[PDB]
């Protein structure tokens, strides 16, 4: 449900996912 | 010496009869200009769409467009 | 893999038959 | 007898003999392929 | 006389043999198409359409067969899983037989055109010398091209007469051949939208018909005639080869990037989907939904389809093979038999670690275990001396859910290392290897081989277009110069 | 035709180039010494090499909002 | 609607037309 | 024997065929 | 033209003013070649003194940071931008030149304008060859440099993830790209690359041997030791003894050239063939299709701990290359590989 | 016209370029990027 | 004058000496 | 590809050598 | 024009170009043998 | 099996080097 938890779940696997490349200007 | 004469050859002879018939003047270079520039801007539109260099209200250029 | 070799050899044989029949040296009659 | 060889000969093989050679090789291959492949 | 690199210039000014050699090239291409798909059907294994699809077997012309609408076969099986009770005349090897009989007809026509070359059609009634009415020939050919494009876009893909096209879901799960309605807006120009293809072909056909009519009407001028070397058929040759490596670059780009007419289900995935975590993101948000509302990660992994996990594998990447890792992907890694589930790694204190995904650029990659915050917690120890990151001293256990292994937690260091190395490549799958003598390395997808071959062909044709441009503009000083 | 021989040996050519070349040299000196290149260019000075927030190399990691992203990751 | 990317596209194309006109003027001004 | 026989068959169908083609073309190009 | 009246128009006036003798030939091809080449060289020379790579690659690549000539480079755009062209007006920069420089968009700008400059230079060769009417074998041989340029600056990044893996405009950056293919691709073991290196060293062979042979089998034409003035621009006789050259090379090498035309055409032939095959090889590399692993040799090395070869030594050195590459060459992967996981030998 | 010799002009240009090259090589032992 | 050779020489003469003076100032830039 | 390499290398040797030999003896037959 | 064809042509290639072609094929086999073998 | 092929094709290569060296086309002075 939460997009921030799946963001931190995809990050240790890879740092090039489209959802990590979109709306990451907050980080 | 003549060639091989055939009915369909006699039928479609006017398709290949005026080998080299041309008109004087420059012809249609203004439409060369406008059509070539239109093809150019069209090809750039599709290039920048496929490059994700242009963003519209209906294009995504991603696999979810299959939905 | 053997069947393709067999079929190739036979189609080559029929090719040689067709070649010998239709593109032979004409008799000279001289 | 001289510096060049006097027995200089030209080898001939016409098109009909070419036909016979090609057919001989291909028919021999067709016949013996089943035994060579075993 | 003419050297070996000029032999075909015996038919530069002979239209009967030009038509004849075009006919026999057409015959050879059609015969190759038929023989190639016969070979592909003979060597195809339809045992598992999901875990061993056609692009995992190196099928090249068969995905193109399945692209336009031919899905069933006379062998009683369809690639989508259904059984072809009445596959009809147009099966895979039925289309092969059609190609073969077309090739035979074209070869006979080629022999006829060679033996009958002195046709008065190639003789103009003005002077009787050899000439071709190039403006009218191009106008006629453009008219036929427009008519065929408009028909293909108005009846074949629209499905009112034809079968439509193969459209799949964004993540390539279901897939189906159906009619597609035209998209007349910017969505029609969306390259991943299949609704633009009928509109594209309809508009292109209408424009081609009008342009061919205008060519049939109006003759060219003297200035372009003496500029573009209009009098030479080699100008047509140079322009046509320019157009075909234009289209070669187009098809190489659209195959490497993916588009509407390039389905993942038929042609394999793209390396950019792996590098963008597309299937992984799909699986993980399919987990976030139905995990955030109860029924936690102990179960519901079986709710994850097995095709999706097969897609989340770097061996499924089209850019993991080599130039000479030759053949089928199954001959590379073995045929997938089942999914063992997503590996969840946990260390001795409780945080959930994750294995780093292998970048496409690497043939080998170290195995590391990273925390949620993005700092490596463990690694496969190369040195194993004065190392304090090894699994043998950190204490990481691996657990699986929803697959052949579900709820099983391994704590043994050797097996957790081996399965971490297996999960380094993505998902975890079991592969049968002794049936095809698998070497071990990864192979390349038909999409990747297609793109490589067409890029090389496009470069060679760019060289050919430069050479033919020189030939066209310099048809007067080949044998020598004017020496004055 | 003036084939590069009389031109360089001509006092008329030399006098009019006794000012322009030193002027261009001085302008090129001042364009870097006054920091105008740093201003209109976006290149970071060694004193403003790093910000206080990040001690490491900058990472854009974006494609569309990269303009305002490099705005907030540059040396202001 | 009209996107900023499309606005920049229109500005770039009219700028290219201006560049073409400037090229023509510079080559005809001997 | 599944592929050594293939190699033997290939050598047998080419080498004398090539030799015959050498002699035939050597005669055909001479009038 | 064509014995018709042909009233002079704007096209005729432009052609007559364009194809004429000047110090620099303008012609029609100068409508593109001059501005595109000028923009490319200006952008590169500006980049090697000004453009910092601290936001594109996180490196130093210009004289403004203190770099020298080799380490200065016009750096590629960030891989997060993918294969975007990075227009200054486009969504990356949106009209702001100052931050368009920090985006690395001038890499794509200079690469594009240099491709158009290559096109314009070939068109200039073709136009000159048309203007004074001899065969365009210079353009035929020039077909290979543009093939190399396309295949390494556009085909490889378009096949890979993005322009970041494309080479950057700069000597040390080209060296980085070269070692990148050494490690990731095993470019030395690539067959098309061996085709190319064989062709290029053979081109060096033919150039050196042709110059030395011509200058060493010269006729007298003398009564003076300076043989350079022995040649006259207007003469229809040979200046070097080709038959003596043929005898010398037949007795030294075993074979010799019997034709100046075929000699010069093969001298043309060797580097164009080499560069075209190298272009095909890097095109094959563009889609991760390499001559990396010999399957049988790696198998016997796997089941034989004593079977050491130079090929296996190269393979192991290449994964060592890549293991050291990843962390400091791929910031967007942020691969925080620890010291222990790095493969290394005893001592050192 | 020929009042200043061409060899003199070339000598001045060459000494300017050589001294500038010496300055640039001096700029590798001081200033930015000089390991100090 | 303003000939084609004039423009061709100046477009490669003015900016190269501009950046040349830039590098000359840039060598003496301290830390 | 242990003996697939054999058959591929064999045909890659055979087809151009037979082709070149045929056209060469065509050349050499006519003096 | 007539029943026989005016483009009746003889193709030629000297032994020097034979040497070029055969050495080209032989060294191509040398280069690609270890790759097709793998 | 591969060693035989390597040796045979390499000795054929050096043999045809020998053939091109000694049994070449003799050039004419005319
Ligand atoms: C459909 C495109 C096309 C067509 C119709 C032609 C037609 C022609 N070309 Mg040409 N060419 C092309 C593309 C094309 N070319 C391309 C892409 C290149 C770049 C490589 C060239 C480079 C080229 C050169 C350098 C020359 C020609 C020449 C010629 C003329 C004589 C050809 C000849 O007899 O050589 C004979 C060819 C052979 C005997 C065998 C060639 C086959 C090679 C060895 C590879 C084998 C391929 C395989 C069997 C099939 C693969 C095909 C498939 C992958 C596409 C002829 C009119 C010649 C010319 O202009 O006359 C002065 C000339 O010298 N071409
Ligand atoms: C558009 C062209 C094209 C493309 C993209 C493909 C692609 C593919 N083919 Mg295919 N094929 C083609 C044309 C093509 N083919 C043609 C024209 C034929 C008829 C001869 C075949 C016959 C064929 C068969 C019989 C088979 C395939 C197979 C395959 C798949 C396995 C990968 C592979 O090819 O190995 C690797 C690709 C390469 C190594 C490319 C080689 C690069 C160049 C050409 C190197 C050679 C140059 C050098 C001078 C040769 C000297 C070597 C010599 C010493 C022996 C793959 C997806 C296999 C398959 O999966 O079944 C369907 C299979 O068994 N193909
Ligand atoms: C009766 C006509 C006909 C029909 C119905 C088919 C049907 C089919 N063919 Mg086929 N073919 C034909 C004729 C035909 N062919 C002929 C005459 C040849 C010899 C040249 C071939 C050679 C051939 C081969 C080699 C192959 C097929 C294949 C196929 C199958 C898949 C098609 C595909 O994916 O390729 C894609 C087709 C296209 C992408 C068509 C694109 C047309 C180009 C891009 C036009 C663009 C240029 C044009 C001038 C632009 C006009 C300008 C405009 C403004 C007007 C399919 C069932 C494939 C197969 O699986 O084998 C069975 C395959 O390998 N065919
Ligand atoms: C030889 C002339 C020439 C050519 C061929 C090009 C070509 C190109 N330039 Mg370039 N440029 C030039 C001169 C030229 N330039 C000059 C002199 C300058 C200095 C001002 C620039 C500065 C420049 C920059 C800063 C950039 C480019 C870029 C580009 C590329 C893409 C341009 C684009 O996005 O839209 C294409 C433009 C055209 C196709 C122009 C044609 C105009 C059409 C045919 C007419 C339509 C306009 C019409 C009036 C519409 C209004 C109708 C209305 C009244 C209703 C492209 C290949 C971009 C790039 O390199 O990408 C990285 C980029 O950012 N150029
Ligand atoms: C790195 C090696 C190398 C360089 C630098 C080079 C340079 C050159 N070759 C030319 C020609 C040729 N090259 C040829 C064959 C070859 N050339 C080769 C190797 C080279 N050739 C090889 C190996 C071959 C064998 C096939 C031929 C056949 C020709 C010609 O016809 C021509 C000539 O007459 O030779 C004297 C000249 C015309 C270029 C020009 O004005 O384009 C105009 C376009 C320009 C200037 C724009 C280019 C801008 C580039 C693409 C982007 C920016 C790059 C920066 C400026 C520099 C970046 C450098 C870093 C990457 C390190 C130029 C001096
Ligand atoms: C057991 C065994 C045998 C051990 C050894 C095994 C071993 C390790 C084998 C590997 C070797 C091997 C072949 C591997 C290499 C594989 C590979 C790279 C293949 C090469 C592929 C190839 C075809 C490249 C094509 C690219 C290209 C066209 C280059 C060709 C280069 C070429 C031939 C150039 C000529 C070179 C050269 C020697 C020039 C001599 C020319 C010459 C005689 C000029 C002299 C001369 C000058 C004048 O001025 C005049 C006037 C006259 C008159 C005159 O004459
Ligand atoms: C030879 C003769 C011509 C000589 C010189 C001509 C010079 C041309 C200079 C411009 C070249 C084109 C540059 C832009 C192309 C581009 O951005 O492509 C990249 C973009 C796609 O962009 C990519 O899309 C992917 C989709 O999964 C991913 O999302 C990537 O992240 C995204 O960057 O495609 C295009 O817009 C044009 C593609 C068609 C052009 C094909 C050229 C060869 C392509 C090869 C692809 C790999 C194989
Ligand atoms: C000599 C000419 C052929 C050389 C290649 C021989 C490959 C050996 C082989 O195994 O083949 C045989 C291979 C099959 O190979 C076998 O396949 C089996 C399943 O089919 C298994 O997977 C086996 O593991 C595998 O070895 O198939 C082929 O025919 C190779 C296709 C060749 C064409 C590929 C595309 C090339 C496209 C463009 C390249 C040219 C570009 C321009 C020029 C440069
Ligand atoms: C006569 C007749 C017939 C029959 C027909 C047939 C049977 C056909 C066929 C055919 C076929 C069965 C074909 C196939 C084929 C193949 C091909 C045509 C191919 C090819 C080639 C190529 C092109 C290649 C190239 C290459 C190589 C060599 C390798 C790899 C790489 C490359 C690519 C380079 C009929 C009954 C109908 C009718 C009547 C009579
Ligand atoms: C960027 C850009 C642009 C463009 C520009 C241009 C087009 C121009 C230019 C420019 C240039 C062009 C510059 C330059 C530089 C240069 C230099 C820097 C140089 C050098 C050289 C040297 C340093 C050397 C010396 C020497 C010596 C000392 C020794 C001996 C002799 C010699 C000579 C070698 C613009 C703005 C539009 C915008 C976009 C981007
Ligand atoms: C290569 C070249 C050139 C040249 C340049 C230059 C830059 C030159 C110079 C130079 C110089 C500018 C020189 C000077 C000098 C002087 C000297 C070399 C001297 C001496 C001697 C001695 C022995 C010493 C002594 C002493 C002592 C012991 C210590 C102190 C005192 C005294 C000094 C007395 C030219 C352009 C023409 C042409 C082209 C290239
Ligand atoms: Fe010479």
- Does the CA dihedral F45-F46-F50-F52 come out positive or negative? negative
Element (DSSP H or E) covering residue E338:
strand E335-339
- Does the CA dihedral K4-K10-K13-K16 come out positive or negative? negative
Q: Report DSSP letters for E258-280, one per residue.
A: --TTS-HHHH---HHHHHTTHHH
Give the Cα separation of L21 and E241 in Å (integer).
32
Check if the beta carbon of residue I134 is closer than 8 Å to that of residue E481: yes
Give the Cα separation of E425 and E365 in Å (integer).
9
User: Which two structure tokens, joined as six digits, stand for B23?
Assistant: 């008109």
For residue N4, the 8-state DSSP code is H
CA D24 distance to own-chain centroid? 9
Element (DSSP H or E) covering residue E429:
strand E429-432
Pairs from B5-8 (Cβ < 8 Å, separation ≥ 24): B5/E120, B6/E119
Q: Is G25 buried (19+), middle (13-18) or exposed (0-12) by CB count in 10 A? A: exposed
Please state the length of chain A: 27
Give the Cα separation of F36 and F29 in Å (integer).
11
User: Which two structure tokens, joined as six digits, stand for I121?
Assistant: 């230079």
What domain range includes position I222?
1-348
Number of folded domains in chain F? 1
Check if the beta carbon of residue I86 is closer than 8 Å to that of residue G7: no
| Rounded alpha-carbon distances, angstroms, from residue M8 to E2, E7, E95 | 11, 11, 40
Residues with CB under 6 A from ligand 7: B 47, 50-51; E 249, 252-253, 256-258, 270, 272, 451, 455, 462; I 82-83, 85, 112, 115, 119, 150, 154, 158-159, 162, 286
Give the Cα separation of I18 and I86 in Å (integer).
34
Check if the beta carbon of residue I326 is closer than 8 Å to that of residue E396: no
User: Which two structure tokens, joined as six digits, stand for I89?
Assistant: 């007006």
Number of folded domains in chain I? 1
Check if the beta carbon of residue E425 is closer than 8 Å to that of residue E444: no
User: Which two structure tokens, joined as six digits, stand for E411?
Assistant: 């704590």
Check if the beta carbon of residue I21 is closer than 8 Å to that of residue K5: no
Helices (H), strands (E): how many in chain E?
Answer: 15, 10
Ramachandran angles phi, psi of E459, nearest 5°: -65, -45
Check if the beta carbon of residue E201 is closer than 8 Å to that of residue E150: yes
Give the Cα separation of E315 and E319 in Å (integer).
9
What is the 3-class SS of F2-62, one letter each residue? CCCCCCCCCHHHHHHHHHHHHHHHHHHHHHHHCCHHHHHHCCCCCCCCCCCCCCCCCCCCC
Element (DSSP H or E) covering residue G22:
helix G4-28
Give the Cα separation of J20 and J16 in Å (integer).
6
Please state the length of chain K: 31
Q: Ligand 4: which of G16, G23, G24, G26 to mutate, most ligand atoms within 8 Å of CB?
A: G16
Check if the beta carbon of residue I218 is closer than 8 Å to that of residue I212: no
Q: Half-sphere exposure (CA, 13 Å, Cβ side) for C4?
A: 9
Give the Cα separation of E189 and E197 in Å (integer).
9
Residues with CB under 6 A from ligand 8: E 43, 58, 326-328, 331, 449, 453, 456-457, 460; I 280; L 1, 4, 8, 12; M 36
- Give the end-to-end CA distance of chain H in Å, rounded to a whole number: 46
- Note whether I191 contacts M: Cβ–Cβ < 8 A: yes
Give the Cα separation of K10 and K20 in Å (integer).
15
Give the Cα separation of I119 and I35 in Å (integer).
12
Find the DSSP H helices in E156-290.
196-217, 222-227, 233-257, 264-267, 271-275, 278-288
Closest Cβ–Cβ partner in F40, F46, F70 for I55: F70
C1 alpha carbon to ligand 8 midpoint, in Å?
A: 16
User: Which two structure tokens, joined as six digits, stand for I154?
Assistant: 């556009």
| Rounded alpha-carbon distances, angstroms, from residue I13 to I29, I33, I39, I124 | 16, 20, 28, 19
- Does the CA dihedral I226-I228-I231-I233 come out positive or negative? negative
Check if the beta carbon of residue E177 is closer than 8 Å to that of residue E228: no
Q: At what angle do helices I33-47 and K4-27 cross, to 10 degrees?
A: 10
- Does the CA dihedral G8-G9-G12-G13 come out positive or negative? negative
Chain N partners of I243 at a C-beta cutoff of 8 Å?
29
Give the Cα separation of I36 and E211 in Å (integer).
34
Q: Half-sphere exposure (CA, 13 Å, Cβ side) for E227?
A: 10
Contact check, Cβ <8 Å, L20/M18: yes
Please compute Rg for chain K using Cα positions: 14
Nearest one of F76, F41, F40 to F58, comparing CA atoms: F76
Where along chain B do its domains lie? 1-53
Method: cryo-EM
Which are the contacts of E180, defined by CB distance < 8 A and separation ≥ 6?
E157, E158, E159, E164, E165, E167, E194, E195, E197, E198
For residue I332, the 8-state DSSP code is G
Chain B partners of G13 at a C-beta cutoff of 8 Å?
41
What is the CATH number for F42? 1.20.5.860
Give the Cα separation of I10 and H21 in Å (integer).
63
Structure's resolution in angstroms? 3.6
- Note whether I208 contacts K: Cβ–Cβ < 8 A: no
For residue G3, the chain I residue with the least C-alpha distance is I91
Give the Cα separation of E19 and E13 in Å (integer).
11
For residue E345, the 8-state DSSP code is E
- I190, I279, I282, I289: best to mutate for the E interface, most E CBs within 10 A: I289
Nearest one of E474, E277, D5, E85 to A22, comparing CA atoms: E277
| Rounded alpha-carbon distances, angstroms, from residue I286 to E252, E318, E442, I281 | 12, 12, 17, 9
Give the Cα separation of I173 and I44 in Å (integer).
13
Which are the contacts of F69, defined by CB distance < 8 A and separation ≥ 6?
A25, F60, F62
Three-state secondary-structure class, residue E446: helix
- Bridge pairing between strands E335-339 and E429-432: antiparallel
- J17, J22, J24: best to mutate for the K interface, most K CBs within 10 A: J24
Give the Cα separation of E165 and E255 in Å (integer).
17
CB pairs under 8 A between F and I: 71
- Note whether I26 contacts K: Cβ–Cβ < 8 A: yes
Which are the contacts of E145, defined by CB distance < 8 A and separation ≥ 6?
E208, E212
User: Which two structure tokens, joined as six digits, stand for E142?
Assistant: 């453009």
What domain range includes position F50?
4-73
Nearest one of I37, E6, I86 to F66, comparing CA atoms: I86
Ramachandran angles phi, psi of E50, nearest 5°: -95, -50
Pairs from K5-8 (Cβ < 8 Å, separation ≥ 24): K5/I22, K5/I23, K5/I24, K8/I23, K8/I24
Give the Cα separation of F33 and F38 in Å (integer).
10
I206 alpha carbon to ligand 12 midpoint, in Å?
A: 11
Element (DSSP H or E) covering residue E368:
strand E368-370
Pairs from I210-219 (Cβ < 8 Å, separation ≥ 24): I210/I263, I210/I267, I213/I240, I213/I245, I213/I248, I213/I249, I214/I239, I214/I240, I215/I240, I217/I241, I217/I242, I217/I244, I217/I245, I217/I248
């Amino acid at each position: 449900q939460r997009v921030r938890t799946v963001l931190d779940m995809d990050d240790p696997a890879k740092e090039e996912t489209v959802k990590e490349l979109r709306k990451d200007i907050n980080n | 010496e003549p060639g091989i004469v055939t009915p369909l050859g006699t039928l479609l002879r006017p398709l290949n009869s005026e080998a080299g018939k041309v008109l004087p003047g420059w012809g249609t270079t203004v439409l060369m200009a406008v059509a070539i520039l239109l093809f150019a801007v069209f090809l750039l539109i599709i290039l920048e769409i496929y490059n994700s260099s242009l963003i519209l209200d209906g294009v995504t250029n991603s696999w979810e467009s299959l939905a | 893999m053997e069947a393709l070799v067999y079929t190739f050899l036979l189609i080559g044989t029929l090719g040689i038959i067709f070649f010998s029949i239709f593109f032979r040296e004409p008799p000279r009659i001289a | 007898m001289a510096r060049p060889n006097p027995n200089k000969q030209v080898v001939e093989l016409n098109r009909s003999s070419l036909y016979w050679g090609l057919l001989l090789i291909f028919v021999l291959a067709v016949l013996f392929s089943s035994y060579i492949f075993n | 006389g003419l050297p070996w690199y000029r032999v075909h210039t015996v038919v530069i000014n002979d239209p009967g043999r030009l038509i004849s050699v075009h006919l026999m090239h057409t015959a050879l291409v059609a015969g190759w198409a038929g023989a190639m798909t016969l070979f592909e059907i003979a060597v195809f294994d339809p045992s598992d359409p999901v875990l061993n699809p056609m692009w995992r077997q190196g099928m090249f012309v068969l995905p193109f067969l399945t692209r336009l609408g031919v899905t069933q076969s006379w062998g009683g099986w369809t690639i989508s899983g259904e059984t072809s009770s009445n596959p009809g005349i147009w099966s895979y090897e039925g289309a092969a037989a059609s190609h073969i009989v077309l090739s035979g007809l074209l070869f006979l026509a080629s022999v006829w055109h060679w033996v009958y070359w002195d046709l008065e059609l190639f003789r103009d009634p003005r002077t009787g010398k050899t000439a071709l009415d190039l403006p009218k020939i191009f106008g006629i050919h453009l008219f036929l091209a427009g008519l065929l494009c408009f028909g293909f876009g108005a009846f074949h893909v629209t499905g009112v007469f034809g079968p439509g096209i193969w459209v799949s879901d964004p993540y390539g799960l279901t897939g189906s051949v159906q009619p597609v309605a035209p998209s007349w807006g910017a969505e029609g120009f969306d390259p991943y939208n299949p609704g633009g293809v009928p509109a594209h072909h309809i508009a292109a056909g209408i424009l081609g018909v009008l342009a061919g009519l205008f060519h049939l009407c109006v003759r060219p001028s003297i200035r372009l005639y003496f500029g573009l070397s209009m009098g030479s058929i080699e100008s047509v040759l140079s322009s046509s080869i320019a157009a075909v490596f234009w289209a070669a670059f187009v098809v190489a780009g659209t195959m490497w990037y993916g588009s509407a007419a390039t389905p993942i289900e038929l042609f394999g995935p793209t390396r950019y989907q792996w590098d963008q975590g597309f299937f992984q993101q799909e699986i993980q948000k399919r987990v976030a939904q139905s995990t955030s509302e109860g029924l936690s990660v102990s179960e519901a992994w079986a709710k994850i389809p097995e095709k999706l996990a097969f897609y989340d594998y770097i061996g499924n990447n089209p850019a993991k093979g080599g130039l000479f890792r030759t053949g089928a992907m199954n001959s590379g890694d073995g045929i997938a038999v089942g999914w063992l589930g997503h590996a969840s790694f946990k260390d001795q204190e409780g945080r959930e670690l994750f294995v780093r995904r292998m970048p496409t650029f690497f043939e080998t990659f170290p195995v590391v275990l990273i925390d949620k915050d993005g700092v490596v917690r463990a690694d496969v120890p190369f040195r194993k001396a004065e190392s304090k990151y090894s699994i043998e001293q950190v204490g990481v256990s691996v657990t699986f859910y929803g697959g052949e292994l579900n709820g099983l937690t391994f704590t043994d260091p050797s097996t957790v290392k081996k399965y971490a190395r297996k999960a380094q490549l993505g998902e975890i799958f079991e592969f049968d290897r002794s049936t095809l003598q698998s070497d071990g390395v990864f192979r390349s997808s038909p999409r990747g081989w297609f793109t490589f071959g067409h890029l090389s062909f496009a470069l060679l044709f760019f060289f050919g277009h430069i050479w033919h441009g020189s030939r066209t503009i310099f048809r007067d000083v080949f044998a020598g110069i004017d020496e004055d | 035709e003036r084939p590069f021989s009389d031109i360089l040996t001509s006092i008329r050519y030399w006098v009019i180039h006794s000012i322009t070349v030193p002027s261009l040299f001085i302008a090129g000196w001042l364009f870097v010494s006054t920091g105008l290149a740093y201003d209109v260019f976006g290149s970071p000075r060694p004193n403003e090499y790093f910000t206080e927030d990040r001690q490491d190399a900058p990472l854009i990691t974006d494609r569309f909002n990269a303009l305002e992203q490099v705005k907030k990751l540059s040396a202001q | 609607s009209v996107t900023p990317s499309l606005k920049n596209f229109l500005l770039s194309l009219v700028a290219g037309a201006v560049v073409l006109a400037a090229i023509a003027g510079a080559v005809t001004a001997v | 024997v599944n592929i050594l026989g293939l190699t033997a068959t290939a050598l047998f169908i080419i080498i004398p065929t090539s030799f015959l083609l050498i002699l035939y073309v050597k005669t055909a190009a001479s009038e | 033209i064509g014995t018709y009246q042909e009233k002079r128009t704007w096209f005729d006036d432009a052609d007559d003013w364009l194809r004429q003798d000047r110090f620099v030939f303008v012609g029609w091809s100068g409508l593109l070649l001059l501005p595109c080449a000028y923009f490319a060289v200006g952008g590169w020379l500006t980049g090697c003194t000004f453009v910092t790579s601290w936001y594109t690659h996180g490196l130093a690549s210009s004289y403004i940071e203190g770099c020298n000539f080799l380490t200065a480079a016009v750096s590629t755009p960030a891989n997060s931008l993918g294969h975007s062209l990075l227009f200054v007006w486009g969504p990356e920069a949106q009209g702001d030149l100052t931050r368009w420089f920090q985006l690395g968009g001038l890499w794509a700008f200079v690469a594009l304008h240099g491709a158009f400059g290559l096109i314009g230079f070939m068109l200039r060769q073709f136009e000159i060859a048309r203007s004074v009417n001899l065969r365009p074998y210079n353009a035929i041989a020039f077909s290979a440099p543009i093939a190399v340029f396309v295949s390494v600056f556009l085909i490889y990044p378009l096949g890979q993830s993005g322009w970041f893996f494309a080479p950057s405009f700069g000597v040390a950056s080209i060296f980085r790209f070269i070692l990148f293919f050494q490690g990731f691709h095993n470019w030395t073991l690539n067959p098309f690359h061996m085709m190319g290196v064989a062709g290029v060293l053979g081109a060096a062979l033919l150039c050196a041997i042709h110059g030395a042979t011509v200058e060493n089998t010269l006729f007298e034409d003398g009564d003076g030791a300076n043989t350079f003035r022995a040649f006259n621009p207007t003469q229809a006789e040979e200046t070097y003894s080709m038959v003596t050259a043929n005898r010398f090379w037949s007795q030294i090498f075993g074979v010799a050239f019997s034709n100046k035309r075929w000699l010069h055409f093969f001298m043309l032939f060797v580097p164009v063939t080499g560069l075209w095959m190298s272009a095909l090889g890097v095109v094959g590399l563009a889609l991760n299709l390499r001559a990396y692993d010999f399957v049988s040799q790696e198998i016997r090395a796997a089941e034989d701990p004593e079977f050491e070869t130079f090929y296996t030594k190269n393979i192991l050195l290449n994964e060592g290359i890549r293991a050291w590459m990843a962390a400091q060459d791929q910031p967007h992967e942020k691969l925080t590989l620890p010291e222990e996981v790095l493969p290394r030998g005893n001592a050192l | 016209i020929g009042r200043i010799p061409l060899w003199l002009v070339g000598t001045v240009v060459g000494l300017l370029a050589i001294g500038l090259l010496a300055i640039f090589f001096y700029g590798s032992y001081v200033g930015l990027g000089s390991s100090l | 004058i303003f000939t084609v050779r004039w423009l061709a020489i100046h477009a490669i003469a003015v900016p190269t000496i501009f950046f040349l003076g830039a590098i000359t100032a840039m060598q003496f830039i301290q830390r």
